[PDB]
Design an enzyme around this catalytic site. Structure first.
Site, PDB file in Angstrom:
ATOM      1  N   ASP A 154       0.828  -1.204   0.000  1.00  0.00           N
ATOM      2  CA  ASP A 154       0.000   0.000   0.000  1.00  0.00           C
ATOM      3  C   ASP A 154       0.867   1.260   0.000  1.00  0.00           C
ATOM      4  OD1 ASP A 154      -1.835   1.998   0.424  1.00  0.00           O
ATOM      5  OD2 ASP A 154      -2.883   0.971   2.070  1.00  0.00           O
ATOM      6  N   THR A 155       1.189   1.761  -1.182  1.00  0.00           N
ATOM      7  CA  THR A 155       2.069   2.918  -1.295  1.00  0.00           C
ATOM      8  C   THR A 155       1.418   4.200  -0.774  1.00  0.00           C
ATOM      9  OG1 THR A 155       1.366   3.303  -3.594  1.00  0.00           O
ATOM     10  CG2 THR A 155       3.387   1.968  -3.219  1.00  0.00           C
ATOM     11  N   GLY A 156       0.093   4.223  -0.656  1.00  0.00           N
ATOM     12  CA  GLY A 156      -0.610   5.350  -0.078  1.00  0.00           C
ATOM     13  C   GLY A 156      -0.661   5.374   1.443  1.00  0.00           C
TER      14      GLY A 156
HETATM   15  C1  LIG Z   1      -8.441  -0.866   2.437  1.00  0.00           C
HETATM   16  C2  LIG Z   1      -7.007  -0.526   2.137  1.00  0.00           C
HETATM   17  C3  LIG Z   1      -6.676   0.965   2.330  1.00  0.00           C
HETATM   18  C4  LIG Z   1      -6.778   1.390   3.793  1.00  0.00           C
HETATM   19  C5  LIG Z   1      -7.541   1.819   1.398  1.00  0.00           C
HETATM   20  N1  LIG Z   1      -7.153   3.257   1.414  1.00  0.00           N
HETATM   21  C6  LIG Z   1      -5.979   3.560   0.562  1.00  0.00           C
HETATM   22  C7  LIG Z   1      -4.784   3.825   1.497  1.00  0.00           C
HETATM   23  O1  LIG Z   1      -3.575   3.901   0.715  1.00  0.00           O
HETATM   24  C8  LIG Z   1      -4.915   5.109   2.328  1.00  0.00           C
HETATM   25  C9  LIG Z   1      -4.804   6.410   1.516  1.00  0.00           C
HETATM   26  C10 LIG Z   1      -5.005   7.601   2.438  1.00  0.00           C
HETATM   27  C11 LIG Z   1      -6.287   7.962   2.840  1.00  0.00           C
HETATM   28  C12 LIG Z   1      -6.472   9.052   3.690  1.00  0.00           C
HETATM   29  C13 LIG Z   1      -5.381   9.783   4.145  1.00  0.00           C
HETATM   30  C14 LIG Z   1      -4.101   9.422   3.747  1.00  0.00           C
HETATM   31  C15 LIG Z   1      -3.913   8.339   2.892  1.00  0.00           C
HETATM   32  N2  LIG Z   1      -3.867   5.127   3.339  1.00  0.00           N
HETATM   33  C16 LIG Z   1      -4.052   4.945   4.638  1.00  0.00           C
HETATM   34  O2  LIG Z   1      -5.089   4.661   5.204  1.00  0.00           O
HETATM   35  O3  LIG Z   1      -2.859   5.147   5.427  1.00  0.00           O
HETATM   36  C17 LIG Z   1      -2.875   5.066   6.859  1.00  0.00           C
HETATM   37  C18 LIG Z   1      -1.679   5.868   7.371  1.00  0.00           C
HETATM   38  N3  LIG Z   1      -1.923   7.297   7.071  1.00  0.00           N
HETATM   39  C19 LIG Z   1      -2.013   8.186   8.251  1.00  0.00           C
HETATM   40  C20 LIG Z   1      -1.933   9.576   7.609  1.00  0.00           C
HETATM   41  N4  LIG Z   1      -1.195   9.314   6.392  1.00  0.00           N
HETATM   42  C21 LIG Z   1      -1.109   8.016   6.145  1.00  0.00           C
HETATM   43  O4  LIG Z   1      -0.430   7.527   5.259  1.00  0.00           O
HETATM   44  S1  LIG Z   1      -8.422   4.256   1.215  1.00  0.00           S
HETATM   45  O5  LIG Z   1      -7.926   5.576   1.022  1.00  0.00           O
HETATM   46  O6  LIG Z   1      -9.205   4.091   2.428  1.00  0.00           O
HETATM   47  C22 LIG Z   1      -9.330   3.802  -0.077  1.00  0.00           C
HETATM   48  C23 LIG Z   1     -10.414   2.929   0.059  1.00  0.00           C
HETATM   49  C24 LIG Z   1     -11.156   2.499  -1.044  1.00  0.00           C
HETATM   50  C25 LIG Z   1     -10.821   2.948  -2.321  1.00  0.00           C
HETATM   51  O7  LIG Z   1     -11.509   2.533  -3.440  1.00  0.00           O
HETATM   52  C26 LIG Z   1     -12.487   1.494  -3.288  1.00  0.00           C
HETATM   53  C27 LIG Z   1      -9.752   3.814  -2.474  1.00  0.00           C
HETATM   54  C28 LIG Z   1      -9.007   4.242  -1.364  1.00  0.00           C
END
Ligand SMILES: CC[C@H](C)CN(C[C@@H](O)[C@H](Cc1ccccc1)NC(=O)OCCN1CCNC1=O)S(=O)(=O)c1ccc(OC)cc1
Lengths: 99, 99
Positions: free
Chosen positions: A25-27
């Site tokens: 999960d690069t996000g």
């Molecule tokens: C279920 C797996 C993941 C948790 C899904 N997330 C993508 C993650 O990469 C998410 C992106 C994000 C969202 C909000 C704020 C920042 C980044 N990353 C994530 O939840 O990271 C947790 C750590 N956080 C804390 C603050 N920054 C971070 O990187 S998601 O953003 O919730 C998402 C869900 C469904 C979708 O399409 C159906 C697209 C995106």
């Protein structure tokens, strides 16, 4: 390996003799795993995702083998929808995005 | 190009008269953009992540340019804290994970 993205990039990880499936999960800055027991001290932390904030347990300096590659780092444990491998460990295994 | 993961993988995208910064997010099935008043029909949807669900508007066949690579597909618009380029568009620009 090279992993394409037509499917979720799920891989098998090893964390305490236990095999789990987790999403590359690069996000995500951080690695967050569903509720499980890990040994040692943990610290209460909070993290925020797309739907708001959750409470997690922060375990530091934890070995995780990710698709055959070794990392040792921070693992957060809590009510994440799915096990996610975040950048903190993706960097350790030399993972990059390429296009 | 190759993008390492020491920092968040933010890139410039364009959707209309809006260039925006967005995460190249292998953990995201779908592309989720911060609130913007896009023209055309849409369908209501709920998507879930850490913290729970948010309500979004699903727009189809929207042209999106990502780092000078053209894409066209579904974009979800709603109260996300970050613009997220998900796998539906990452595949179109030839993006892979590599380690
Ligand atoms: C279920 C797996 C993941 C948790 C899904 N997330 C993508 C993650 O990469 C998410 C992106 C994000 C969202 C909000 C704020 C920042 C980044 N990353 C994530 O939840 O990271 C947790 C750590 N956080 C804390 C603050 N920054 C971070 O990187 S998601 O953003 O919730 C998402 C869900 C469904 C979708 O399409 C159906 C697209 C995106």
């Amino acid at each position: 390996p090279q992993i394409t993205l037509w499917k979720r990039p799920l891989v098998t990880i090893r964390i305490g003799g236990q095999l789990k499936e987790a999403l590359l999960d690069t996000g995500a800055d951080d690695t967050v795993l569903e509720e499980m027991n890990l040994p040692g001290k943990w610290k209460p932390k909070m993290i925020g995702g797309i739907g708001g904030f959750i409470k997690v347990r922060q375990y530091d300096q934890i070995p995780i083998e990710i698709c055959g590659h070794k990392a040792i780092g921070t693992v957060l444990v809590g009510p994440t929808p799915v096990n996610i491998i975040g950048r903190n460990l993706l960097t350790q295994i030399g993972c990059t995005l390429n296009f």
